[PDB]
């Protein structure tokens, strides 16, 4: 009986909601009211990296917080030095429609993907002195939204067919397939210990996956629109989700409930990217109104804005040591803020 | 100069990379881009053939003009999540099959394929990204349409129709219905051509539409027109 199964599912979700309501004790603001606010934050543009000729769609800092890779619609993948302005590498892509990129933790590999449904892995250190394609991972049907390296031989990708995959680079075959999402998966992030990862989809929900078991652990909901960005807290026990209804939300893995929401009446446009700073006190979120807000994690109030882009900000990132921030926009200009 | 020899060599390498990048951009900025958006995958293959994974790129040359055609029929994903990647395309080529006015799309009781074509055309034409890009309509499969319309009059598709069942003043009715879906006639123009299976001048028609669009855009940028 299908109706009996639907009734059982409704009863289970109702009792899950009741248990979650009973688990809540006090709001986050009720505990953080005594905290001293960080005050207004004033950042300056230390560097302005230029050379791209189309919209920049992704970027990712290196493990040494000195090199960074960027991808644009030109069909080029540029590896920049950040202390100086010099371009270390410029890799021409086989497909001009790229919407994501990643930089390996060891620094020997780079990844890219987009509308071609194929994840290209490039090897940087070789005897011939030129960057050449090392692997072309294929098997996804929908477009590739994000990719994140775990080690030199394993990668995690998310596609537009409501699917995530764990690829072994050596053999090239899929290892574990994560399914269950209703809408297209837009972004993912790995835990600091590299044991679980959260994926946000277009069905106004997020999920927590275990790479080893391959089964979904927990599901979170509450957003009323598409979810575009997601990122773990530096502690690894919470994560922040940015959505298309001009709202950010903080979720806790152990509490299984949302803690705080960041929204304002003057902002109506959606959120493109969300990233925590070091120690997780700040939360930098890009917006469609050409600005980037700096919210407080413990205080719902704002703490500063970044306005230096003439077009939509499409990506942002924070260095491992927390020394500087970087923003790339639909205007062909990367900026470094400190 | 407070720079070491290795730093100077790195600066020289970066400058050479900049030169190569600007040369590539200058080379690639002088190409015409056409986004081929179909409706039910009807006639797209034939039109691609006559003009010689998830996206298919077709490159060709006509009258010293380089054309790049992008086909996204195999994405079958949510169109609103990646359509903004195509903002700035020179033209959008829309293909509409006239033959499926009687045909009914599967999994639905009464929902005509022409209604799907009109809905998709309305969605694409009035998109917030393609507010300036020009649409080139392509009404194909007109022959077996001509024999079919004799058997069944063109009234199932449009109840509010009154006229002769012959080919004349019937295909023009559907063309007018498609052209009337435009709501931005001040800043957009639609080109229409009836294409046969053995037609050859389709590439010439696309070239003429593209050069007209180029001229109009060039004169509109300067503040004239």
């Amino acid at each position: 009986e299908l109706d009996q199964l639907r009734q059982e599912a409704e009863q289970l979700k109702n009792q899950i909601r009741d248990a979650r309501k009973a688990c809540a004790d006090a709001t986050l603001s009720q505990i953080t009211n005594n905290i001293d606010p960080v005050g207004r934050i004033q950042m300056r543009t230390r560097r302005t990296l230029r050379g791209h000729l189309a919209k920049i769609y992704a970027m990712h800092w290196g493990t040494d917080s000195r090199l960074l890779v960027s991808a644009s619609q030109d069909g080029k993948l540029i590896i920049w030095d950040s202390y100086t302005t010099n371009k270390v590498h410029a890799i021409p892509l086989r497909s001009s429609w790229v919407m994501t990129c990643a930089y390996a933790p060891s620094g020997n590999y780079v990844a890219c993907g987009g509308l071609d449904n194929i994840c290209s892995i490039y090897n940087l250190k070789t005897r011939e002195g030129n960057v050449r394609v090392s692997r072309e991972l294929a098997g996804h049907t929908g477009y590739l939204s994000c990719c994140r390296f775990l080690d030199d031989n394993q990668i995690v990708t998310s596609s537009g067919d409501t699917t995530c995959a764990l690829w072994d680079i050596e053999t090239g075959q899929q290892t574990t397939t994560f399914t269950g999402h209703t809408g297209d998966v837009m972004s993912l992030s790995l835990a600091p210990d590299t044991r679980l990862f959260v994926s946000g989809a277009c069905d106004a929900s997020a999920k927590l996956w275990d790479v080893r078991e391959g089964m979904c652990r927990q599901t979170f909901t509450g957003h009323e629109s598409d979810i575009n960005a997601i990122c773990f807290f530096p502690n690894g026990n919470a994560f922040a989700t940015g959505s298309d209804d001009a709202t950010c939300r903080l979720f806790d893995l152990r509490a299984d409930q949302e803690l705080m929401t960041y929204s304002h009446d003057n902002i109506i446009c959606g959120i493109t990217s969300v990233s925590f700073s070091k120690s997780g006190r700040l939360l930098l979120a890009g917006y469609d109104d050409f600005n980037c807000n700096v919210w407080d994690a413990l205080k719902a109030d704002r703490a500063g804005v970044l306005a230096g882009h003439d077009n939509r900000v499409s990506c942002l990132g924070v260095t491992d040591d927390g020394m500087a921030v970087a923003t790339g926009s639909w205007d062909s200009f990367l900026k470094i803020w400190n | 100069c407070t720079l070491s020899a290795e730093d100077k060599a790195a600066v020289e390498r970066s400058k050479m990379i900049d030169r190569n990048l600007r040369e590539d951009g200058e080379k690639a900025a002088r190409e015409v881009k056409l986004l081929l958006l179909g409706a039910g995958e009807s006639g797209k293959s034939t039109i691609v053939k006559q003009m010689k994974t998830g996206i298919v790129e077709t490159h060709f040359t006509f009258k010293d003009l380089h054309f790049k055609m992008f086909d996204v029929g195999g994405q079958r994903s949510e169109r609103k999540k990646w359509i903004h990647c195509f903002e700035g395309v020179t033209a959008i080529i829309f293909c509409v099959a006239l033959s499926d006015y009687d045909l009914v799309l599967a999994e639905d009781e009464e929902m005509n394929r022409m209604h799907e074509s009109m809905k998709l055309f309305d969605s694409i034409c009035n998109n917030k990204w393609f507010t300036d890009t020009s649409i080139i309509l392509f009404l194909n499969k007109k022959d077996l349409f001509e024999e079919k319309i004799k058997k069944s009059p063109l009234t199932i598709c449009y109840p509010e129709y009154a006229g002769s069942n012959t080919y004349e003043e019937a295909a023009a009715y559907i063309q007018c219905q498609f052209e009337d879906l435009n709501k931005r006639k001040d800043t957009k123009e639609i080109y229409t051509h009836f294409t046969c299976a053995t037609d050859t001048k389709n590439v010439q028609f696309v070239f003429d539409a593209v050069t007209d669009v180029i001229i109009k855009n060039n004169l509109k940028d300067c503040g004239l027109f």
Epitope: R66, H89, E128, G129 | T2, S4, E6, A9, A10, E12
Partner: single-chain antibody
Framework: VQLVESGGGLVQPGGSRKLSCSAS????????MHWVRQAPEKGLEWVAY????????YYADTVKGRFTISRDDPKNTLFLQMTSLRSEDTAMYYC??????????????WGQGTTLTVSSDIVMTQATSSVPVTPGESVSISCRSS???????????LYWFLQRPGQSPQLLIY???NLASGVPDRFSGSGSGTAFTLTISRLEAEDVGVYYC?????????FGAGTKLEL
């Protein structure tokens, strides 16, 4: 992947000669190129350098004004044309590659070399000339300078090269700390400012040769005297 050099032989003094160096197996256009001399009974000595794209060309003061360097990018070729040769130019010549970017390893690959017979600068001293030691015990080789090789950006410019008998010099450690690719982890380098030392934990039959310390702070690229490891 390899470099082959042609030319040399016997030359009447006062004449002219042209030496060629052909590369195969790597992107020749993106590598700066060096010509390095070695006297028949002495250590190495820098001669000339040409950048990628021929943007900058540098010559040693001994051969400046009569030597000419050139490159052929449509092909993969490097030319050195010498004029008004004298009795001091008889030596072995090596064709070396070097790429320059953040994290690169210059002087990675050296050519076979060709022989030619004819019938201020940063000085670096190597007091060691012969170190007899049994294999299996750690050894240290010291190299001093006359100027601070450390730079304001934190980089230091000291390279170590090994030349086994009847072979070509091999890069061991660049910037005195970064071990080169393809060598055992036995070699290590240390030092600060003026004096530096290279340490080998366990000697083997393949570690016998001559060790040179070379500076890349500024041109000309002065080499060390070199020390030998006898058994």
């Amino acid at each position: 992947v390899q470099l082959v050099e042609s030319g040399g032989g016997l030359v009447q003094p006062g004449g002219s000669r042209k030496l060629s160096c052909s590369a195969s197996g790597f992107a020749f256009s993106s590598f700066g190129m060096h010509w390095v001399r070695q006297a028949p009974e002495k250590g190495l000595e820098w001669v000339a350098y040409i950048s990628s794209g021929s943007g900058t060309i540098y010559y040693a003061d001994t051969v400046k004004g009569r030597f000419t360097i050139s490159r052929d990018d449509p092909k993969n070729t490097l030319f050195l044309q010498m004029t008004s040769l004298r009795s001091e130019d008889t030596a072995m010549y090596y064709c070396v590659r070097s790429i320059y970017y953040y994290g690169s390893s210059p002087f990675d690959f050296w050519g076979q070399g060709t022989t030619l017979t004819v019938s201020s600068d940063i000085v670096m001293t190597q007091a060691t000339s012969s170190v007899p030691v049994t294999p299996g015990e750690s050894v240290s080789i010291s190299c001093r300078s006359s100027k601070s090789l450390l730079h304001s950006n934190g980089n230091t410019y000291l390279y170590w090269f090994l030349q086994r008998p009847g072979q070509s010099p091999q890069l061991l450690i660049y910037r005195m700390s970064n071990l080169a690719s393809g060598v055992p982890d036995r070699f290590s380098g240390s030092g600060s400012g003026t004096a530096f030392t290279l340490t080998i934990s366990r000697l083997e039959a393949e570690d016998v040769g001559v060790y040179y310390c070379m500076q890349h702070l500024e041109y000309p690229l002065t080499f060390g005297a070199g020390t030998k490891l006898e058994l």
